[PDB]
Amino acid sequence: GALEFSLLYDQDNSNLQCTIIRAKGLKPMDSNGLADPYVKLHLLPGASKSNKLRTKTLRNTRNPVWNETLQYHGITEEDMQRKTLRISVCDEDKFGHNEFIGETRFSLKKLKANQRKNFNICLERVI
C-alpha cells in the first residue's frame, strides 16, 4: 500500500517529467488472487483534453516495478504553481469489472525549476 515515484521539473523546456518507480504490497485483486496493475497520471484542475497520461500495465504480480517516465509537454511555470500532480493506481482484470488500488496528490507548486525530488508515501482510500 505504498508508492514510490520521482518527479523532475525542467524550466529550460518547461517540461514536467514524472517517474513512477514502483508499488509495494498490493492487496487481493482478482477472485483468483492474481493482479494486473497500471498507473495513470492526471493533472487537476485542468482540461480533460489530454491532461491525462497512462502508464504501462504489468500482469500477474503483487509488487511490480514500473520505472516509467511520463512526460507532460506544454506546461508553464504558471501551471506548475496552479496545478496538482495526481498519481492514480488502478487494477485491470478480465472483460468484466475493475478495482481502484490507490492514488496520490501533490501540488506542483512544490516543484522547483530544474529540481528532481523522490517520493515514497502510503496511498489513502478513495470514494
Please list every residue from 45 through 74 that binds Ca ion, using CB under 5 A. none
Nearest by Cα to 8 from 111, 120, 121: 111
93 sits near Ca ion (criterion: CB under 5 A): yes
29 sits near Ca ion (criterion: CB under 5 A): yes
For residue 36, say whether it is annotated as part of any ligand binding site: yes
Inter-residue contact 67 to 21 (CB < 8 Å): yes
Distance CA(15)–CA(11), nearest Å, equals: 7
For residue 78, say whether it is annotated as part of any ligand binding site: no
- Name which position in 4, 10, 36, 68 contacts Ca ion (CB under 5 A): 36
16 sits near Ca ion (criterion: CB under 5 A): no
Minimum Å gap between C-beta 20 and Ca ion is: 18
Q: Which residues pair with 20 in a beta bridge?
A: 5, 68
Distance CA(44)–CA(24), nearest Å, equals: 25
Minimum Å gap between C-beta 60 and Ca ion is: 8
99 sits near Ca ion (criterion: CB under 5 A): yes
89 sits near Ca ion (criterion: CB under 5 A): no
Handedness of CA 57, 87, 40, 26 (dihedral sign): positive
For residue 79, say whether it is annotated as part of any ligand binding site: no
State which residue, 10 or 93, has the beta carbon closest to Ca ion.
93
Handedness of CA 116, 120, 122, 123 (dihedral sign): positive
CA–CA–CA angle 67, 106, 79 (5° rounding)? 100
Residues that bind Ca ion (CB under 5 A): 29-30, 35-36, 91, 93, 99
| Annotated binding-site residue numbers for Ca(2+) | 29-30, 36, 91-93, 99
